[PDB]
Amino acid sequence: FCRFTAEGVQEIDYKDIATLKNYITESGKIVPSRITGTRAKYQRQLARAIKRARYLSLLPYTDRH
Amino acid sequence: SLSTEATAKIVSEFGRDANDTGSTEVQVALLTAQINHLQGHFAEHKKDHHSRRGLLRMVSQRRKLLDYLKRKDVARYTQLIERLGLRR
Amino acid sequence: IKVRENEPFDVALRRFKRSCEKAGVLAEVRRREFYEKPTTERKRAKASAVKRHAKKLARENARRT
Amino acid sequence: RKQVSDGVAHIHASFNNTIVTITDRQGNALGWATAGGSGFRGSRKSTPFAAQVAAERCADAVKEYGIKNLEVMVKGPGPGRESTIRALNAAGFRITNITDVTPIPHNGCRPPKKRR
Amino acid sequence: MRHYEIVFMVHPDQSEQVPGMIERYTAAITGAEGKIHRLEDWGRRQLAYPINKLHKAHYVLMNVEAPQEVIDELETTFRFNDAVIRSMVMRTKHAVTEAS
Amino acid sequence: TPEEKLLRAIFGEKASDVKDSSLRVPNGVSGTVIDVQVFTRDGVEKDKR
RNA sequence: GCUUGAGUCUCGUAGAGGGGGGUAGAAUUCCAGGUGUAGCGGUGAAAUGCGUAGAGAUCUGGAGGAAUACCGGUGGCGAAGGCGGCCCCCUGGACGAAGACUGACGCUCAGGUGCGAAAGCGUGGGGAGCAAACAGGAUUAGAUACCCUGGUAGUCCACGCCGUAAACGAUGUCGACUUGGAGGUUGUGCCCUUGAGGCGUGGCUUCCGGAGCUAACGCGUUAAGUCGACCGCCUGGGGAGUA
Known part of the structure; x- marks a missing residue:
């Protein structure tokens, strides 16, 4: 039940990470779609946001090495 | 892929209206224009076996409305292949 | 991954690790991949997970003893 | 020696092997002990009690260096990690930070086939 | 013609000689028929994970409407620039102006 | 409320918890607001005001 | 000649569909350098082997070859087979709101053509993990089997050949008709989408059941139900799906 991918219209970009640091666990993992209740489609769309965040170094692959 | 910028022009030339696209000389030239532009796809990389059934589809259907124009107006049939050139 | 907590512990506490x-x-890294298991266990597994919910709705009807 | 207070106890516990290893803050093994080097050859190599003796066999001659506040980076999720981490915390140390640094790749090559 | 959300990071070393290249890149889009949607220079924001050598890179955003054959030459230049270490683009149709 | 929670538990902070309970002109007045003097949060400054 | 059949066009949608190339992170084997121990692997138990010519382990760096985590959903694409990171070039199939048209232009099919996982072979590269042939220690009355330490064809990529399967919800393909629900996945129209709702309309798929069928289990709008069209096949098993 969130106003992210239901009322928050038009794909959520990874530029504003003041919200994406809520979707990743403080390490680098992703929070399951059964935890933060969002429709599987947009959890893959947020999976596209987090993926490109891992490609442009905003949201890493993991915390440290 | 048959660009829309070209489709509306073929229907503009061959078809007698902007939207009277359900006629013989339209659907044929349209699908023929698909092939004519599809050259770039089945020339390079070559190994598109799944895209082969897509070809199968549109080429055969084309030969189906020609399959009908033949039984109706042989004057326009030889004329259609004469303007655009879709026999060869 | 990494837990600290300055000095109110007196214990190893692997809480955030397991969290x-x-x-x-x-x-996933100890034994061989086995190209088949994913198919198998992704399906079998979640099917049975759905059964618990189905159990929730079908166990409250009668039971009049 | 080495003039260090911050040590790094790398613990690799796979199956029948549990190795406690206090190293320098870099990873310079200043001393270690195996549960299989402390005897217990066999099924006991897979027993946390041997693991706690290992924690001790590796907790000695380390304050000769000067380590008190130490890091415990484990790269071996075995049967101990209580029996031994709480052992160093029982030896008299204060583990500033208890770490679990599991290397995480997106699944790559293939490991051996086993147990079947 | 086509929308490409070009986001790139250069070296904190080029943190001062890149705004001059900001003039270069977008002026080239002007010399290649194209409008920019949001010209931004935030600063040398701290990276997520260290990229081979140094942490904290200099981020700069463009998000520009230019031909694909032009951004193709452009990403080539980015990839072949000692400043830019990473530079990727998105797909067409959609565009932004907030980015915050 | 049940159907609104979790948003203000993940998304942000002040994006919902706050509402609007303004003040209005008492019935019986038909004039013009003239002077306005306001003051802000000592020690930990308010917004742009 | 006309349309409720097929199909095309206008405007859009999601993805392990495919082909060619490239990129990212990290890792097993091996090599070298700093430290250091006398043990390591493994099994029900034991052991060949390795090691003091300093292994296993730990930190950093590096060349090859191959594989895609959490997100993952009896979910998705397809004739079938089969197939999961991403991007770039190109393209197809499935489906839908509201309309304009050709006017049955449709379905299937022996010989035939094409697709055909995996594997074997001819050729150019190839070798980390593993593994036919083979060697060794043993449970044992024996071991050319289960275990373990090595290792060649192979596993990978491209061009051809054999044209083979549990190539199986075991149920051929196409159309029409016959009370529903919990679901999953992907669009849209209408109403105050004020909000993650309500009422209809299609594809795929699972389970519980009605009419019906069957030896029975059970299938059941994706039917093993009711009809029509087209195709292959059977007449007890073995012999043999073999010469």
Whole structure:
């Protein structure tokens, strides 16, 4: 039940990470779609946001090495 | 892929209206224009076996409305292949 | 991944470790891949997970003893 | 020696092997002990009690260096990690930070086939 | 013609000689028929994970409407620039102006 | 409320918890607001005001 | 000649569909350098082997070859087979709101053509993990089997050949008709989408059941139900799906 991918219209970009640091666990993992209740489609769309965040170094692959 | 910028022009030339696209000389030239532009796809990389059934589809259907124009107006049939050139 | 907590512990406490992933890497890297298991267990597994919910709705009807 | 207070106890516990290893803050093994080097050859190599003796066999001659506040980075999720981490915390140390640094790749090559 | 959300990071070393290249890149889009949607220079924001050598890179955003054959030459230049270490683009149709 | 929670538990902070309970002109007045003097949060400054 | 059949066009949608190339992170084997121990692997138990010519382990760096985590959903694409990171070039199939048209232009099919996982072979590269042939220690009355330490064809990529399967919800393909629900996945029209709702309309798929069928289990709008069209096949098993 969130106003992210239901009322928050038009794909959520990874530029504003003041919200994406809520979707990743403080390490680098992703929070399951059964935890933060969002429709599987947009959890893959947020999976596209987090993926490109891992490609442009905003949201890493993991915390440290 | 048959660009829309070209489709509306073929229907503009061959078809007698902007939207009277359900006629013989339209659907044929349209699908023929698909092939004519599809050259770039089945020339390079070559190994598109799944895209082969897509070809199968549109080429055969084309030969189906020609399959009908033949039984109706042989004057326009030889004329259609004469303007655009879709026999060869 | 990494837990600190300055000095109110007097214990190892692997809480955040097991809260992040910890074993989730070991379970997949110890033995051979076996190209078949994914198909198998993704399906079988979640099917049975759905049954618990189905159990919730079908166990409250009668039971009049 | 080495003039260090911050040590790094790398613990690799796979199956029948549990190795406690206090190293320098870099990873310079200043001393270690195996549960299989402390005897217990066999099924006991897979027993946390041997693991706690290992924690001790590796907790000695380390304050000769000067380590008190130490890091315990484990790269071996075995049967201990209580029996031994709480053992160093029982030896008299204060583990500033208890770490679990599991290397995490997106699944790559293939490991051996086993147990079947 | 086509929308490409070009986001790139250069070296904190080029943190001062890149705004001059900001003039270069977008002026080239002007010399290649194209409008920019949001010209931004935030600063040398701290990276997520260290990229081979140094942490904290200099981020700069463009998000520009230019031909694909032009951004193709452009990403080539980015990839072949000692400043830019990473530079990727998105797909067409959609565009932004907030980015915050 | 049940159907609104979790948003203000993940998304942000002040994006919902706050509402609007303004003040209005008492019935019986028909004039023009003239002077306005306001003051802000000592020690930990308010917004742009 | 006309349309409720097929199909095309206008405007859009999601993805392990495919082909060619490239990129990212990290890792097993091996090599070298700093430290250091006398043990390591493994099994029900034991052991060949390795090691003091300093292994296993730990930190950093590096060349090859191959594989895609959490997100993952009896979910998705397809004739079938089969197939999961991403991007770039190109393209197809499935489906839908509201309309304009050709006017049955449709379905299937022996010989035939094409697709055909995996594997074997001819050729140019190839070798980390593993593994036919083979060697060794043993449970044992024996071991050319289960275990373990090595290792060649192979596993990978491209061009051809054999044209083979549990190539199986075991149920051929196409159309029409016959009370529903919990679901999953992907669009849209209408109403105050004020909000993650309500009422209809299609594809795929699972389970519980009605009419019906069957030896029975059970299938059941994706039917093993009711009809029509087209195709292959059977007449007890073995012999043999073999010469």
